Design a binder for this molecule. Structure first.
Ligand SMILES: *[C@@H]1O[C@H](CO)[C@@H](O[C@@H]2O[C@H](CO)[C@@H](O[C@@H]3O[C@H](CO[C@@H]4O[C@H](CO[C@H]5O[C@H](CO)[C@@H](O)[C@H](O)[C@@H]5O)[C@@H](O)[C@H](O)[C@@H]4O)[C@@H](O)[C@H](O[C@H]4O[C@H](CO)[C@@H](O)[C@H](O)[C@@H]4O)[C@@H]3O)[C@H](O)[C@H]2NC(C)=O)[C@H](O)[C@H]1NC(C)=O
Ligand SMILES: *[C@@H]1O[C@H](CO)[C@@H](O[C@@H]2O[C@H](CO)[C@@H](O[C@@H]3O[C@H](CO[C@H]4O[C@H](CO)[C@@H](O)[C@H](O[C@H]5O[C@H](CO)[C@@H](O)[C@H](O)[C@@H]5O)[C@@H]4O)[C@@H](O)[C@H](O[C@H]4O[C@H](CO)[C@@H](O)[C@H](O)[C@@H]4O)[C@@H]3O)[C@H](O)[C@H]2NC(C)=O)[C@H](O)[C@H]1NC(C)=O
Ligand SMILES: *[C@@H]1O[C@H](CO)[C@@H](O[C@@H]2O[C@H](CO)[C@@H](O[C@@H]3O[C@H](CO[C@H]4O[C@H](CO)[C@@H](O)[C@H](O)[C@@H]4O)[C@@H](O)[C@H](O[C@H]4O[C@H](CO)[C@@H](O)[C@H](O)[C@@H]4O)[C@@H]3O)[C@H](O)[C@H]2NC(C)=O)[C@H](O)[C@H]1NC(C)=O
Ligand SMILES: *[C@@H]1O[C@H](CO)[C@@H](O[C@@H]2O[C@H](CO)[C@@H](O[C@@H]3O[C@H](CO[C@H]4O[C@H](CO)[C@@H](O)[C@H](O)[C@@H]4O)[C@@H](O)[C@H](O[C@H]4O[C@H](CO)[C@@H](O)[C@H](O)[C@@H]4O)[C@@H]3O)[C@H](O)[C@H]2NC(C)=O)[C@H](O)[C@H]1NC(C)=O
Ligand SMILES: *[C@@H]1O[C@H](CO)[C@@H](O[C@@H]2O[C@H](CO)[C@@H](O[C@@H]3O[C@H](CO[C@H]4O[C@H](CO)[C@@H](O)[C@H](O)[C@@H]4O)[C@@H](O)[C@H](O[C@H]4O[C@H](CO)[C@@H](O)[C@H](O)[C@@H]4O)[C@@H]3O)[C@H](O)[C@H]2NC(C)=O)[C@H](O)[C@H]1NC(C)=O
Ligand SMILES: CCCCCCCC/C=C\CCCCCCCC(=O)O[C@@H](COC(=O)CCCCCCCCCCCCCCC)COP(=O)([O-])OCC[N+](C)(C)C
Ligand SMILES: CCCCCCCC/C=C\CCCCCCCC(=O)O[C@@H](COC(=O)CCCCCCCCCCCCCCC)COP(=O)([O-])OCC[N+](C)(C)C
Ligand SMILES: CCCCCCCC/C=C\CCCCCCCC(=O)O[C@@H](COC(=O)CCCCCCCCCCCCCCC)COP(=O)([O-])OCC[N+](C)(C)C
Ligand SMILES: CC(C)CCC[C@@H](C)[C@H]1CC[C@H]2[C@@H]3CC=C4C[C@@H](O)CC[C@]4(C)[C@H]3CC[C@]12C
Ligand SMILES: CC(C)CCC[C@@H](C)[C@H]1CC[C@H]2[C@@H]3CC=C4C[C@@H](O)CC[C@]4(C)[C@H]3CC[C@]12C
Ligand SMILES: CC(C)CCC[C@@H](C)[C@H]1CC[C@H]2[C@@H]3CC=C4C[C@@H](O)CC[C@]4(C)[C@H]3CC[C@]12C
Ligand SMILES: CC(C)CCC[C@@H](C)[C@H]1CC[C@H]2[C@@H]3CC=C4C[C@@H](O)CC[C@]4(C)[C@H]3CC[C@]12C
Ligand SMILES: CC(C)CCC[C@@H](C)[C@H]1CC[C@H]2[C@@H]3CC=C4C[C@@H](O)CC[C@]4(C)[C@H]3CC[C@]12C
Ligand SMILES: OC[C@H]1O[C@H](O)[C@@H](O)[C@@H](O)[C@@H]1O
Lengths: 197, 50, 253, 206, 206, 247, 51
């Protein structure tokens, strides 16, 4: 859920060389002391707690091993990634669809789509330096990034098909009857109809 | 149209001249730099006479 | 076998260290024989100063020296000799050596430098002449530059009426700027000479710039308004009668 | 802690807190030193002749205060420290010359698209979308410099996102204007209402 | 094989203050059913171990190595080596580099379906080349500049750059052919027979 | 470490060591004379003037003194008038034009009886600018030259904005290179910085004027009507100072 | 157009086949079943070598 992720981070503390039968450790409080805690610009500590644990391995019946684990639940403050990562991706995603309102005769459809893709590729630098380079799972930033990339590429492919269709003439192709029926007869009936048949 | 075609043919001829000139200049410069790099070898002796 | 701090040691240090560290990484132990012979083999991680000859980078070879000498004792107190038992070379155990993936060792001699001309001191210098293995730069820099150069050539076969000469030439220039950004992370920063890779990159940039300029000239000739512009007679003679025969351009009819 | 809101035109309040690591306020206490005249030096001292200002930061103020606390009955032994507050101002010239001015000019370039012809060779969309690409390059540049906290958004980032949104809107507008300009009677029918609005009413209202 | 690579790291332990003459190194011995066995692997607590975010441990052997050629009083005679064979988990590189790079490279084949009258063929091809250059810039920061091999992603990027350059050259040739006129070129009957009748029939063109 | 030593400190230490930390051996003569030649890495704070960068000269200094001893109990004297550069390794970025050490003695009003001594060694250095000339200045010069070519490119090519905007894009991408290479300070504007800003404004002005030229070229005869001032200035008067055929 | 169609049917299979080859070398790259080539032992806690 990065950048809206929640992280549970522990700190396991114990006497390295003394077992419970010679040195016993107990917590001073149920919670860590956060009275002198400096505010963080990236994380909010929702919950914090300390738990004592005792373990006895079968080979060692009489020497319990003690530890105190202090766990912290932390929520990332997502504003930086929203402003610097998500909003540009959203703008590119919006710009992707605008090619389909551009006339073919403008000679700028490929310019627009390819420039959107070039912007997204340059943005890959920002994302990879800011995103975590781990393979435990795909972040939401990564999923949205790949989504935008894939659909810009899809827009480019379909735009090439549209331009190819637009430039067809009787000296190169003959119009199939099903194309006439589907696109020139049925579909425009359920559309704006401001366009003349 | 005839005058326009004369100007266009002049442009084509100049383009072909520049094509050949660029091929020659590119090949010569690239070959010079690449041969300068290739024939830079480590010294045969640790302590060459200078 | 005795802890090194328990015996007298010669204060042999790397004089030409670059980080301020003169000494060995771990003192370990000396081996003392019954005749008083002491052998000491301490490990050391050393960062030494090597003046880089940048002229032929990345097809370069370097001459990185490690100068070892006593920091305090003079030649009248401690005399140095190249260690041997007479191989005056850096020893490299063939099986256990960690070969570097970017450098091949060509030569590895050692020499005793006598004092120039007490306070005078000998030195033992271990030289490493190393050749770079440039495959990374061939794949990542040189080959793309060659491809961009080929595209710059092929701009002159693109017809003027396509309206695409400028786009091709100038995007080739933009791609070369991206490769300049690539090289900025890697090249040396000294100013005694220019690396040959930088020379090749600037050569390619100048070529693409001239391709842009000459494409503009060709487009200016192609789109020249017939009424506002009158062909001068020398232009007719040279470019329509003389040059086409030499360039094997047969104007139809 | 860097207050990012007005970066690079920002000022910061960096504290230097000094205290005994061992002794409490009953064991060791602090007072400020006095100058030759006996005036208490309740500030950071700076030798003017030997001082060289930081290349990016000017020290505007530097008061000092001796604080005493935790003297309550429950708290037990009192504690004390000395806090100096360096109020420092950034000198923003680098960001003005290298980032803000070029970004402002390049983002102003999209307004020129409204003056290019709405034909096949006008390159209206060339100007707009490539300005967006240049702004993406500037986003990559600015990401290397800005602080990486989320308490607020820095001025530099806010301006860049604002001009990116404006460029996106102008791209949409250029697409719309091209779509309207290139309509042919063999595809579209002459909408009389919009024609009345744009050709007859708007010039009169203008 | 990067990013589908596996590595073979090692941790070699020995004594520099003592030799095989003075200490003998051996592997730890554990017991089961009153039968002793050597511990010939790196121990990993199954419950406490958190796996690395990019590396999976496949094998983790341990070995005592004795060099028969070295003298017994050399420090290099004996050692114990703990090896880690680790496989990279390539999900990150896949999602963020390889799928976009492959898709962008494969888009260059679309120029063959664009008409020459669109006026945007070479721009598409050269822009794909630019995007590949950006990807090469990205990869160059992530691997060492060794010469033992070209990385797999490097091989693909070089192959794609060469193919895109070839496609740009082909687009130039196609445009040159398209824009020929009687005033500039002669269309021979052989070329017409080959390209307008024979090849379109073979290729099942419309 | 066994003997009394003077506690020399680099007064203008920036973020390194204030005093000697490498305690090498002292040579002691039978007459009591001690020589002690420790090494150090000095990180000295120095006012850096970037006005003429990449062709800048930097007069830097190293102030040395006994931190806790004043001149009345410990006196320091220079061995020589100049720093010893006999074992100086050549630099690939700087050339030491001048170097000199000066002793100074200062008496404060509150302390009329304890003069405070120091020895300040200064080095006047010139930067070697070839690296910045080749890597930074030459690409900017090429972009500036390409800027003017748009005014020789005909409008009917439909490529004017392609050339101009792509030059702008190349310069913007190059700005990443410049920010990586040049230092980032706000004490003053470097010469590279001034040239970089000049080139950028040059390109932006070219784009604006190119848009004006394109708009003039495409002015429809129906909607627009030629002002008499344009006709007199451009069709009637100016071409006489040039050589092209009138309308 | 005919040249464009021939180039579509020649270049695209070359691209697909080359990409498939280059990536299939890596997809089927795996560490060997045993840690040491020539040694059949697995060095796993399951396969203890009792003395
Ligand atoms: C740069 O950075 C420095 C350091 O952060 C800034 O200085 C600090 O500014 C704070 C205000 O923003 C100051 O806090 C206020 O102090 C007022 C002083 O009045 C005294 O209050 C005493 C009360 O007990 C104090 O000490 C105990 C110690 O245990 C502590 O728990 C209390 O919270 C309190 O600090 C009293 O004993 C004494 O006689 C004075 O009357 C105080 O009145 C303020 O309280 C108001 O605001 C708080 C807001 O939370 C509110 O709860 C209260 O009811 C009340 O309305 C503040 O506590 C702080 O003391 C400054 N520190 C110094 C000077 O050392 C500096 O301003 C910054 N500079 C800028 C931004 O330019
Ligand atoms: C780079 O920057 C460094 C500084 O960091 C520059 O170094 C300066 O070089 C000049 C010479 O070019 C130095 O001036 C000389 O100083 C000596 C020694 O002065 C000391 O000793 C004196 C007693 O012998 C003493 O009187 C001096 O004290 C004076 O100043 C203090 C205040 O600072 C004042 O309170 C006193 O009352 C005095 O007025 C000081 O302790 C001095 O002997 C030289 O005199 C000869 O030359 C001068 C030339 O003007 C001439 O006037 C004299 O008559 C005499 O012939 C001279 O003054 C200066 O001190 C150095 N500053 C340092 C090191 O801090 C360096 O030049 C810069 N390089 C470049 C090229 O820019
Ligand atoms: C982030 O990660 C940490 C671990 O790092 C998690 O911490 C765990 O917290 C739980 C409690 O929430 C710990 O479980 C135990 O809590 C018991 C408290 O008693 C309550 O619960 C029982 C059972 O429902 C009720 O009967 C009772 O009335 C209370 O409501 C303790 O009694 C447990 O102690 C037992 O085990 C220890 C260990 O051997 C023995 O020493 C004790 O004698 C006793 O037998 C226990 O402490 C759990 O152990 C914690 N784990 C660790 C490792 O600290 C956080 O919850 C997690 N945060 C998230 C994800 O929100
Ligand atoms: C890598 O770098 C090392 C140094 O870091 C280079 O080593 C230097 O190599 C040069 C050339 O081989 C050496 O120069 C030669 O030194 C000889 C010995 O000089 C010593 O003995 C004389 C006589 O007592 C003393 O006067 C002198 O101070 C030295 O103590 C000289 O005999 C040579 O002179 C001959 O050649 C010169 C050529 O110019 C003639 O002018 C002379 O008349 C004479 O015929 C010569 O000067 C130099 O000493 C080496 N430095 C060392 C060892 O520290 C490596 O060459 C370099 N490797 C590579 C391949 O780049
Ligand atoms: C990850 O990396 C480690 C190294 O860091 C690899 O470990 C090496 O594995 C190889 C193959 O198992 C080892 O090579 C073999 O060594 C055997 C023992 O050699 C010692 O003993 C002989 C006498 O018996 C001495 O002569 C020799 O000097 C040594 O002291 C040999 O018996 C093996 O011979 C076999 O291979 C050769 C190949 O030429 C054949 O000719 C033989 O007939 C025979 O089949 C072999 O040489 C090597 O020693 C290991 N290095 C170590 C332990 O440091 C891992 O295999 C690697 N993991 C991977 C890649 O998955
Ligand atoms: C932020 C920093 C960077 C700024 C970047 C540069 C500044 C960018 C911002 C704005 C200024 C850009 C001006 C470019 C003019 C081009 C020439 C032109 O078309 O003239 C026009 C006059 O235009 C006017 O009517 C006057 C406009 C002045 C606006 C000044 C705002 C500042 C001609 O008008 P027309 O013939 O009726 O045009 C018909 C065709 N059309 C509908 C397509 C227009
Ligand atoms: C037809 C379409 C166009 C074709 C496209 C082919 C694209 C490359 C395909 C992959 C080649 C891999 C290769 O074996 O490269 C070799 C040539 O290495 C070179 O030197 C080649 C690069 C030369 C760059 C230009 C030099 C100009 C002078 C070097 O290989 P290696 O580094 O010894 O080992 C590589 C890794 N391996 C061991 C797994 C093989
Ligand atoms: C048709 C033909 C068109 C040709 C177009 C050619 C264009 C050529 C353009 C050349 C520009 C050269 C700039 C040099 C700056 C020098 C430093 C400076 O004064 O900066 C100051 C801040 O300056 C700012 O804040 C910048 C403001 C914007 C400047 C550019 C506006 C472009 C408008 C476009 C619409 C800092 O003040 P300072 O610290 O007092 O400066 C000391 C300077 N000294 C050391 C030299 C004394
Ligand atoms: C864009 C193109 C036309 C420019 C470069 C063309 C020519 C000059 C290039 C292309 C490939 C080059 C060769 C590639 C590799 C080698 C092997 C090396 O051991 C010596 C140089 C040599 C033999 C090169 C010489 C120059 C060369 C022939
Ligand atoms: C290739 C051409 C057309 C454009 C680029 C020009 C380049 C190659 C020029 C510009 C400045 C030049 C350098 C200027 C001075 C020196 C110092 C000396 O050691 C001679 C060579 C050397 C190092 C030159 C090498 C070539 C150089 C780097
Ligand atoms: C899209 C256009 C209109 C605006 C572009 C600038 C964006 C980044 C600006 C516009 C309004 C801004 C927000 C306004 C107010 C606040 C509350 C403050 O406590 C934290 C920052 C926060 C949440 C700002 C973050 C940045 C912000 C979202
Ligand atoms: C056109 C589509 C397929 C996108 C391009 C996919 C390219 C980049 C290929 C090259 C190598 C491929 C990977 C190789 C191995 C595997 C097998 C399995 O672990 C799941 C898929 C996965 C991880 C593949 C995903 C797709 C992949 C990354
Ligand atoms: C041809 C283009 C898209 C290049 C990328 C090809 C990728 C997507 C393809 C080529 C062959 C594919 C592999 C073929 C077979 C298997 C085995 C099965 O368990 C699924 C995953 C896996 C391992 C595939 C992963 C994806 C793969 C690597
Ligand atoms: O010129 C005299 C002046 O010279 C210098 C010093 O070292 C000072 O002590 C003395 O006052």
């Amino acid at each position: 859920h990065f950048p809206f992720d929640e992280q549970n981070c522990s700190m396991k503390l114990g006497t390295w060389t003394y077992d419970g039968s010679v040195v016993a450790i107990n917590p001073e409080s149920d919670q860590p002391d956060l009275s002198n805690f400096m505010e963080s610009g990236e994380w909010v500590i929702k919950e914090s707690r300390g738990w004592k644990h005792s373990v006895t391995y079968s080979c060692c019946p009489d020497t319990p091993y003690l530890d105190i684990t202090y766990h912290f639940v932390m929520q990332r403050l997502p504003l930086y990634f929203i402003v610097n990562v998500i909003i540009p991706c959203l703008l590119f995603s919006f710009l992707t669809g605008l090619v389909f309102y551009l006339p073919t005769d403008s000679g700028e459809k490929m310019t627009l789509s390819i420039s959107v893709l070039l912007s997204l590729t340059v943005f890959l630098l920002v994302i990879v330096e800011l995103i975590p380079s781990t393979s435990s799972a795909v972040p939401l930033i990564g999923k949205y990034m790949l989504f935008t990339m894939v659909f810009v590429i899809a827009s480019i492919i379909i735009t090439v098909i549209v331009i190819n269709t637009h430039h067809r003439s009787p000296s190169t192709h003959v119009m199939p009857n099903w194309v006439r029926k589907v696109f020139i007869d049925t579909i425009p009936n359920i559309m704006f109809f401001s366009t003349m048949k | 149209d005839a005058l326009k075609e004369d100007w266009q043919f002049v442009a084509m001829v100049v383009d072909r001249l520049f094509l050949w000139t660029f091929i020659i200049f590119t090949s010569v410069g690239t070959l010079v730099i690449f041969l300068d790099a290739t024939y830079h070898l480590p010294p045969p002796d640790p302590f060459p006479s200078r | 076998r005795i802890t090194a701090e328990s015996v007298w040691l010669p204060d042999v240090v790397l004089l030409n260290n670059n980080d301020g560290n003169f000494d060995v990484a771990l003192d370990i132990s000396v081996v003392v024989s019954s005749d008083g012979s002491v052998r000491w083999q301490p490990p050391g991680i050393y960062r030494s100063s090597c003046s880089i000859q940048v002229t032929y980078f990345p097809f370069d070879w370097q001459n990185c020296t490690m100068v070892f000498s006593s920091y305090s004792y003079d030649s009248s107190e401690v005399s140095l000799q190249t260690g041997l038992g007479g191989h005056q070379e850096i020893h490299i155990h063939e099986g256990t050596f960690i070969e570097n993936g970017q450098w091949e060792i060509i030569h590895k001699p050692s020499r005793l430098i006598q004092p120039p001309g007490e306070g005078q001191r000998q030195e033992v210098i271990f030289y490493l002449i190393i050749r770079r293995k440039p495959l990374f730069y061939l794949v990542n820099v040189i080959a793309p530059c060659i491809l961009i150069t080929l595209l710059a050539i092929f701009v002159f076969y693109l017809p003027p009426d396509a309206g695409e000469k400028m786009g091709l030439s100038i995007f080739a220039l933009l791609t070369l700027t991206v490769f300049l950004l690539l090289l900025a992370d890697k090249v040396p920063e000294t100013s005694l000479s220019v690396p040959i890779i930088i020379k090749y990159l600037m050569f390619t940039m100048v070529l693409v710039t001239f391709s842009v300029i000459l494409s503009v000239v060709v487009l200016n000739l192609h789109h020249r308004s017939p009424h506002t512009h009158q062909m001068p007679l020398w232009v007719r003679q040279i470019f329509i009668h003389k040059l086409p025969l030499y360039l094997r351009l047969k104007r139809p009819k | 802690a860097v207050e990012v809101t007005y970066f690079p035109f920002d000022w910061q309040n960096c504290s230097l807190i000094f205290r005994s690591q061992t002794y409490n306020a009953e064991e060791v206490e602090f007072t400020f030193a006095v100058d030759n005249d006996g005036k208490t030096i309740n500030k950071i001292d700076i030798d003017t002749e030997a001082y060289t200002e930081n290349g990016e930061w000017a020290i505007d103020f530097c008061p000092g205060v001796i604080r005493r606390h935790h003297g309550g009955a429950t708290d037990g032994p009192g504690e004390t420290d000395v806090i100096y507050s360096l109020i420092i101002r950034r000198k923003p010239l680098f960001y003005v010359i290298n980032i803000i001015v070029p970004c402002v000019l390049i983002s102003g370039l999209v307004l020129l698209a409204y003056f290019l012809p709405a034909q096949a060779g006008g390159q209206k969309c060339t100007v707009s979308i490539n300005v967006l690409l240049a702004q993406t390059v500037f986003l990559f540049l600015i990401a290397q410099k800005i602080p990486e906290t989320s308490l607020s958004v820095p001025l530099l980032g806010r301006f860049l996102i604002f001009v990116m949104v404006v460029a996106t809107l102008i791209v949409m507008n250029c697409v719309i204007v091209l779509n309207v300009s290139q309509r042919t009677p063999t595809t579209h029918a002459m909408s009389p209402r919009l024609r009345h609005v744009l050709l007859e009413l708007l010039p009169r209202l203008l | 094989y990067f990013p589908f690579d596996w590595q073979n790291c090692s941790l070699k332990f020995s004594s520099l203050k003592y030799t095989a003459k003075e200490i003998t190194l051996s592997l730890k011995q554990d017991a089961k059913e009153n039968r002793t066995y050597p511990v010939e692997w790196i121990i990993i607590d199954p419950e406490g171990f958190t796996e690395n975010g990019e590396w999976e441990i496949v094998h983790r052997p341990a070995r005592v190595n004795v060099d028969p050629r070295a003298p017994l009083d050399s420090p290099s005679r004996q050692d114990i080596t703990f090896y880690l064979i680790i496989r990279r988990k390539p999900l990150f590189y896949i999602i963020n580099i390889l799928v976009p790079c492959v898709l962008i490279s494969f888009m260059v084949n679309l120029v063959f379906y664009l008409p020459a009258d669109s006026g945007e063929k070479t721009s598409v091809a050269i822009s794909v080349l630019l995007a590949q250059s950006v990807f090469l810039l990205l990869i160059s920061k992530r691997l060492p500049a060794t010469s033992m091999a070209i990385p797999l992603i490097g091989k693909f990027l070089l192959f794609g750059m060469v193919l895109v350059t070839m496609v740009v050259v082909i687009c130039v040739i196609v445009l040159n052919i398209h824009f020929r006129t009687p005033s500039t070129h002669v269309l021979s009957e052989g070329v017409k027979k080959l390209f307008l009748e024979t090849l379109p029939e073979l290729l099942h063109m419309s | 470490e066994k003997i009394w030593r003077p506690d020399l400190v680099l007064y203008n230490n920036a973020d390194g060591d204030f005093a000697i930390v490498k305690f090498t051996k002292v040579l002691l003569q039978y007459t009591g004379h001690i020589t002690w030649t420790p090494p150090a890495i000095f990180k000295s704070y120095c006012e850096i003037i970037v006005t003429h960068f990449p062709f800048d000269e930097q007069n830097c200094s190293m102030k040395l003194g006994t931190w806790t001893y004043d001149g009345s109990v410990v006196a320091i004297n220079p061995e020589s008038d100049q720093p010893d550069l006999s074992n100086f390794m050549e630099s690939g970025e700087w050339v030491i034009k001048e170097s000199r050490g000066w002793k100074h003695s200062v008496t404060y009003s509150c302390c009329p009886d304890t003069p405070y001594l120091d020895i300040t060694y200064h080095f006047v250095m010139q930067r070697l600018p070839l690296y910045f000339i080749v890597n930074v200045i030459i690409p900017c010069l090429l972009f500036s030259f390409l800027t003017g070519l748009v005014f020789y490119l005909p409008t009917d090519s439909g490529e004017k904005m392609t050339l101009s905007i792509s030059v702008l894009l190349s310069l913007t991408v190059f700005l990443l290179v410049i920010v990586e290479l040049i230092p980032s300070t706000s004490s003053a504007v470097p010469l590279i910085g001034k040239y970089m800003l000049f080139t950028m404004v040059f390109v932006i002005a070219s784009i604006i004027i190119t848009v004006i030229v394109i708009n003039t070229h495409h002015r429809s005869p129906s909607t627009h009507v030629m002002p008499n001032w344009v006709r007199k200035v451009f069709i009637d008067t100016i071409p006489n100072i040039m050589f092209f055929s009138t309308m | 157009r005919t040249v464009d169609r021939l180039c579509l049917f020649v270049v695209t299979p070359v691209m697909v086949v080359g990409t498939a080859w280059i990536f299939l070398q890596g997809v089927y790259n795996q560490p060997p079943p045993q840690p040491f080539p020539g040694d059949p032992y697995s060095y796993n806690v399951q396969d203890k070598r009792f003395i």
